[PDB]
Amino acid sequence: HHWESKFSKEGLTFDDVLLVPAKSEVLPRDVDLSVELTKTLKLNIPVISAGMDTVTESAMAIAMARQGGLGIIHKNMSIEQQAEQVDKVKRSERGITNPFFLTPDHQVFDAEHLMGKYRISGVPIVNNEEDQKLVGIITNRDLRFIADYSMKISDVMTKEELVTASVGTTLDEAEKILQKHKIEKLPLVDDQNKLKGLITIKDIEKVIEFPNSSKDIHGRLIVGAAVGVTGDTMTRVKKLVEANVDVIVIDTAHGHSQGVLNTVTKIRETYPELNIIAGNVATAEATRALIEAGADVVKVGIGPGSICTTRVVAGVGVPQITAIYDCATEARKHGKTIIADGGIKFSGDITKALAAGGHAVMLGSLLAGTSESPGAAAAPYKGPVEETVYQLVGGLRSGMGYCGSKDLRALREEAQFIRMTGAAA
Amino acid sequence: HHWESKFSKEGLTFDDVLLVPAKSEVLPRDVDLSVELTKTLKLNIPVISAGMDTVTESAMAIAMARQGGLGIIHKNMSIEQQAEQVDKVKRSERGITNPFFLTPDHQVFDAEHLMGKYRISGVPIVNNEEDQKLVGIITNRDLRFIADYSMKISDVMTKEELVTASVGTTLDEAEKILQKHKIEKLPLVDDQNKLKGLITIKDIEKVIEFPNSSKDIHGRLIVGAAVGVTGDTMTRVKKLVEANVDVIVIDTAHGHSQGVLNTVTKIRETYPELNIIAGNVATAEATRALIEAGADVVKVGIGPGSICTTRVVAGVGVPQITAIYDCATEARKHGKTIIADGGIKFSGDITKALAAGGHAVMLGSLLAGTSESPGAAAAPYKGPVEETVYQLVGGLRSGMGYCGSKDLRALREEAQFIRMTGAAA
Amino acid sequence: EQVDKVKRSERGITNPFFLTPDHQVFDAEHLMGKRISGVPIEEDLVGIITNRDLRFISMKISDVMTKEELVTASVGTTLD
Ligand SMILES: Nc1ncnc2c1ncn2[C@@H]1O[C@H](COP(=O)(O)OP(=O)(O)OP(=O)(O)OP(=O)(O)OC[C@H]2O[C@@H](n3cnc4c(N)ncnc43)[C@H](O)[C@@H]2O)[C@@H](O)[C@H]1O
Ligand SMILES: Nc1ncnc2c1ncn2[C@@H]1O[C@H](COP(=O)(O)OP(=O)(O)OP(=O)(O)OP(=O)(O)OC[C@H]2O[C@@H](n3cnc4c(N)ncnc43)[C@H](O)[C@@H]2O)[C@@H](O)[C@H]1O
Ligand SMILES: Nc1ncnc2c1ncn2[C@@H]1O[C@H](COP(=O)(O)OP(=O)(O)OP(=O)(O)OP(=O)(O)OC[C@H]2O[C@@H](n3cnc4c(N)ncnc43)[C@H](O)[C@@H]2O)[C@@H](O)[C@H]1O
Ligand SMILES: [Mg+2]
Numbered sequence: 001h002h003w004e005s006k007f008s009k010e011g012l013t014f015d016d017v018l019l020v021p022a023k024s025e026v027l028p029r030d031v032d033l034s035v036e037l038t039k040t041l042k043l044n045i046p047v048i049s050a051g052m053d054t055v056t057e058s059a060m061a062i063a064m065a066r067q068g069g070l071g072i073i074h075k076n077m078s079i080e081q082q083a084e085q086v087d088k089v090k091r092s093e094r095g096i097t098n099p100f101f102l103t104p105d106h107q108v109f110d111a112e113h114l115m116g117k118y119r120i121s122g123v124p125i126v127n128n129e130e131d132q133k134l135v136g137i138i139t140n141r142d143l144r145f146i147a148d149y150s151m152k153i154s155d156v157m158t159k160e161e162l163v164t165a166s167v168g169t170t171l172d173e174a175e176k177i178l179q180k181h182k183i184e185k186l187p188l189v190d191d192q193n194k195l196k197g198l199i200t201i202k203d204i205e206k207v208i209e210f211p212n213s214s215k216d217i218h219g220r221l222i223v224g225a226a227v228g229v230t231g232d233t234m235t236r237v238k239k240l241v242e243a244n245v246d247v248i249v250i251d252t253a254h255g256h257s258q259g260v261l262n263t264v265t266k267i268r269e270t271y272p273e274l275n276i277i278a279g280n281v282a283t284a285e286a287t288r289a290l291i292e293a294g295a296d297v298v299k300v301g302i303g304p305g306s307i308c309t310t311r312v313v314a315g316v317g318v319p320q321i322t323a324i325y326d327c328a329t330e331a332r333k334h335g336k337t338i339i340a341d342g343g344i345k346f347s348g349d350i351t352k353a354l355a356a357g358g359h360a361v362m363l364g365s366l367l368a369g370t371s372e373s374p375g376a377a378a379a380p381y382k383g384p385v386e387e388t389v390y391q392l393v394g395g396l397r398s399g400m401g402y403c404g405s406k407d408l409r410a411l412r413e414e415a416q417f418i419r420m421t422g423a424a425a
Numbered sequence: 426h427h428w429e430s431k432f433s434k435e436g437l438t439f440d441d442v443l444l445v446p447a448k449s450e451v452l453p454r455d456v457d458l459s460v461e462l463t464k465t466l467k468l469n470i471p472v473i474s475a476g477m478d479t480v481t482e483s484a485m486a487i488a489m490a491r492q493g494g495l496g497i498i499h500k501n502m503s504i505e506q507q508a509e510q511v512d513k514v515k516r517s518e519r520g521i522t523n524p525f526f527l528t529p530d531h532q533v534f535d536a537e538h539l540m541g542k543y544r545i546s547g548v549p550i551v552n553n554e555e556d557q558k559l560v561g562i563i564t565n566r567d568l569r570f571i572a573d574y575s576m577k578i579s580d581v582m583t584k585e586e587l588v589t590a591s592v593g594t595t596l597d598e599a600e601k602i603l604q605k606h607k608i609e610k611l612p613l614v615d616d617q618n619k620l621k622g623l624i625t626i627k628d629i630e631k632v633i634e635f636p637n638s639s640k641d642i643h644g645r646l647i648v649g650a651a652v653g654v655t656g657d658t659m660t661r662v663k664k665l666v667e668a669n670v671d672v673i674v675i676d677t678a679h680g681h682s683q684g685v686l687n688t689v690t691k692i693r694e695t696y697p698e699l700n701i702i703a704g705n706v707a708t709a710e711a712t713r714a715l716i717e718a719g720a721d722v723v724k725v726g727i728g729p730g731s732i733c734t735t736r737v738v739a740g741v742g743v744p745q746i747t748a749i750y751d752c753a754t755e756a757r758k759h760g761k762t763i764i765a766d767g768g769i770k771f772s773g774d775i776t777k778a779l780a781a782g783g784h785a786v787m788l789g790s791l792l793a794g795t796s797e798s799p800g801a802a803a804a805p806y807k808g809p810v811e812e813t814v815y816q817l818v819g820g821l822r823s824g825m826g827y828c829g830s831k832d833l834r835a836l837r838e839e840a841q842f843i844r845m846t847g848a849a850a
Numbered sequence: 851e852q853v854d855k856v857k858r859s860e861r862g863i864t865n866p867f868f869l870t871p872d873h874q875v876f877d878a879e880h881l882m883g884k885r886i887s888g889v890p891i892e893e894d895l896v897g898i899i900t901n902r903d904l905r906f907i908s909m910k911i912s913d914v915m916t917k918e919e920l921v922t923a924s925v926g927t928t929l930d
């Protein structure tokens with residue numbers, strides 16, 4: 001009876017529904033925004049930057065993970081390029097154990113070279129290349145007090161009221177030492193005053209602004225990489241796994257194809273522990289096919305947005321709220337999660353997408369023209385990506401406060417919608 | 426079964442419905458617009474100016490009460506400031522028992538001082554500071570007939586055809602005396618011609634234009650004040666009660682919180698007779714929680730307006746017609762009333778809000794740029810607030826005429842709506 | 851006064867701006883913004899507060915300034 005059911009289905013989009021306020025005991029700032037996409041992949045904010053070549057490369061993926069989200073390195077480059085991008089994010093936060101140093105024998109020019117080359121403002125000076133023993137430190141404010149000179153750095157450096165800290169001192173204590181002594185550098189020494197590391201004001205400042213950073217169990221920022229369905233994707237996945245990628249995104253325009261299902265299964269059987277995100281699907285039947293094939297997370301998004309290309313060109317699409325809810329309903333029965341990829345235009349759409357069933361939202365166009373987005377080339381400049389993400393999570397926190405949702409699980413399971421007519425807009 | 430009811434609710438806004446005409450026996454001018462918010466708080470028009478810092482201070486609250494409505498002094502100032510604003514409205518209409526006078530000893534300059542200082546056009550002249558006995562009156566039209574002079578006011582004042590009235594004469598008789606004798610001042614004297622008061626043309630003119638003024642039982646204009654949920658709100662309420670505030674508005678963005686419920690209850694238990702307006706809520710469950718907590722009037726408004734911030738930022742909102750009706754349905758079961766706060770844009774929306782269940786509508790943006798609105802600073806000038814309120818109540822009167830509603834109770838209980846599709850707009 | 855202010859300039863300041871340990875850093879920043887970078891710390895010297903001191907501070911109170919390490923010169927000290 002397929003001829004009769006041809007027009008029996010109804011579809012709700014973001015603009016069709018509003019979230020109903022309920023009794024609340026939680027302020028927006030006390031809301032838990034963490035989400036467990038799988039046992040090995042956990043975010044602190046449910047935001048993922050899309051695997052698009054105008055959205056996510058290493059700079060975006062690092063920024064996203066610093067804020068608690070996740071970045072998916074796009075697949076529109078060769079396999080070597082993509083393994084290097086994943087590796088660049090995994091090695092970003094190295095904690096500097098190897099500090100760049102110098103000796104009183106060198107000239108002041110030597111010090112400017114180091115500062116100007118690496119955008120560094122301080123050089124710790126050790127007694128010899130071998131018994132690295134801290135004798136002094138030289139900095140730009142020191143250079144300001146000298147007319148260009150090659151005098152020995154020893155008569156130029158700071159030596160009398162030299163301030164160090166031991167290896168293992170906390171970042172808080174490091175901050176207070178910098179704040180009291182009115183200095184911005186804090187070399188780390190051992191028992192015998194061997195130079196062992198360096199802590200700077202801006203290392204502490206970046207911990208203050210990114211305390212929810214999402215990291216693997218070894219303290220490295222999480223990152224994902226995009227995979228299609230081609231001949232060399234098994235080689236692409238292999239190099240990405242060798243770069244310690246945290247999750248592979250089998251990314252296709254129509255994931256409910258047998259060629260996609262086979263690609264999911266043979267990656268799963270090759271790497272049983274790997275995290276697999278597979279999309280794009282928009283029905284429960286397709287969600288069940290991807291999970292049965294071996295996918296951990298199902299990405300939802302066929303034709304979202306009122307007048308996107310999929311709808312105008314092919315006539316195909318599923319209103320995103322209905323897509324999220326139907327796919328989430330199927331994914332619950334298997335204990336799997338859902339990523340909502342598509343037409344989020346305001347922060348309120350994030351609250352709607354997550355209520356409805358989505359465990360995380362994927363964003364691209366909203367982050368496409370940001371500072372950490374690839375290239376300096378036709379997208380308007382939207383500033384640092386953390387400005388956009390801050391307001392997006394700010395709205396989500398506000399919505400969960402209205403809904404009395406202390407965590408995302410309560411928003412997904414319990415939040416109620418009210419259907420609108422659209423009449424005033 | 427919260428997962429299945431996630432999208433079971435429907436919501437109507439103002440643009441979804443029109444009021445159906447019924448058999449009418451009442452003209453718009455004969456419609457009774459009074460409303461009883463509680464036993465101690467009664468309005469002559471169901472219009473309240475919002476407790477917003479761009480809408481209602483003492484000037485707005487006085488104007489609103491003069492027309493039969495109510496003004497809610499906003500909470501964005503300190504406690505002392507807010508008690509002074511409430512007191513300023515309570516002392517506005519003092520009835521002048523203490524008239525500013527002078528004696529024939531003084532110079533004509535003395536009289537100009539008084540007139541220019543207080544925007545006064547007349548000074549009654551008494552024989553001595555003690556036996557205040559009326560001898561004369563001096564006015565600007567008198568000053569016009571003199572080149573600047575310091576001559577004794579006695580050779581300048583009006584004495585031969587001096588017109589007085591007794592204490593206790595009506596305002597009508599005062600008017601006719603002014604109209605016959607072609608004068609604009611009427612001093613009030615006692616049996617022995619002691620100066621006891623003064624009646625002017627513009628005192629009578631303001632009674633003609635504001636005969637529906639809403640007042641407490643002691644003849645003072647009613648006023649309300651806004652309270653949040655902070656540490657010092659109990660001190661704020663106390664000073665406001667000490668300023669003879671008529672109603673406290675516990676004003677929050679999400680009133681269905683336990684911190685709000687507790688604030689309502691401990692104010693109620695502290696002041697058993699005080700009038701409490703608590704909002705903002707948009708469901709019957711929240712209306713029941715506020716009433717049970719001890720609120721007299723429930724303010725309804727979460728996300729009204731098509732593209733307001735609550736909807737765009739948080740994704741939260743309830744279409745206002747549905748919100749009003751569901752909250753009014755609950756409030757009836759407890760014998761309490763409802764204030765409709767939100768997206769009124771035309772006078773016809775007032776008629777819709779009140780039919781549906783609202784006992785009064787709260788307006789802010791429509792009154793934000795009026796003359797009595799705070800500040801001379803980004804809002805377009807909309808003129809005297811009485812121009813806006815006149816057309817708003819004019820539309821409501823027209824709608825009740827179409828509905829055959831002789832009073833607001835008949836509009837609330839009996840008026841029928843017809844649901845529209847929106848198709849032509 | 852305007853003429854005298856020009857004639858006395860390029861001398862390399864007998865009447866500098868001053869504060870006391872009772873004031874708050876908010877007083878200093880505004881005195882700075884109105885383009886000086888240092889404010890020596892009543893009627894009858896205890897410290898010095900500068901712009902870089904403000905980086906490690908949060909208007910607080912001005913008594914947490916540069917108070918112990920004070921380098922001062924005599925009146926008559928040459929530019930050299
Ligand atoms: N060797 C290295 N290897 C690897 N990464 C490195 C590195 N050196 C720097 N980095 C990295 O580069 C960045 C550090 O520079 P930034 O953190 O970016 O620079 P800044 O502190 O903002 O510079 P500023 O110009 O304000 O400081 P100032 O000269 O006044 O300087 C501070 C003032 O305090 C004084 N001072 C500093 N330390 C002192 C000490 N121990 N004792 C006494 N005085 C000290 C100075 O003389 C000066 O007056 C970080 O990313 C850091 O990890
Ligand atoms: N002492 C006081 N204490 C407190 N509040 C006070 C006050 N005096 C005034 N106010 C207040 O200030 C306002 C009164 O002034 P407004 O009411 O605002 O002024 P106006 O009458 O419009 O002034 P106009 O300029 O037209 O009048 P004219 O000089 O022609 O004047 C009327 C004309 O009639 C004549 N006239 C008036 N009274 C007369 C009398 N009893 N006998 C004979 N001639 C009289 C005059 O000579 C003149 O020609 C009200 O708010 C009032 O309550
Ligand atoms: N009170 C006043 N009255 C009248 N005219 C005034 C005035 N103050 C300034 N002016 C005028 O303002 C003009 C502008 O010159 P400045 O404002 O001096 O500008 P600058 O030399 O470029 O200073 P900068 O801004 O680099 O200082 P920073 O805090 O980085 O670096 C300063 C560093 O010095 C240190 N420091 C200063 N005194 C110290 C002390 N006694 N002991 C220890 N450290 C001290 C601070 O800790 C800080 O690290 C002057 O020419 C002068 O005419
Ligand atoms: Mg510096």
Ligand SMILES: [Mg+2]
Nearest residue numbers: 546565566609
């Ligand atoms: Mg006149």
Ligand SMILES: [Mg+2]
Nearest residue numbers: 141887901902
């Ligand atoms: Mg500087």
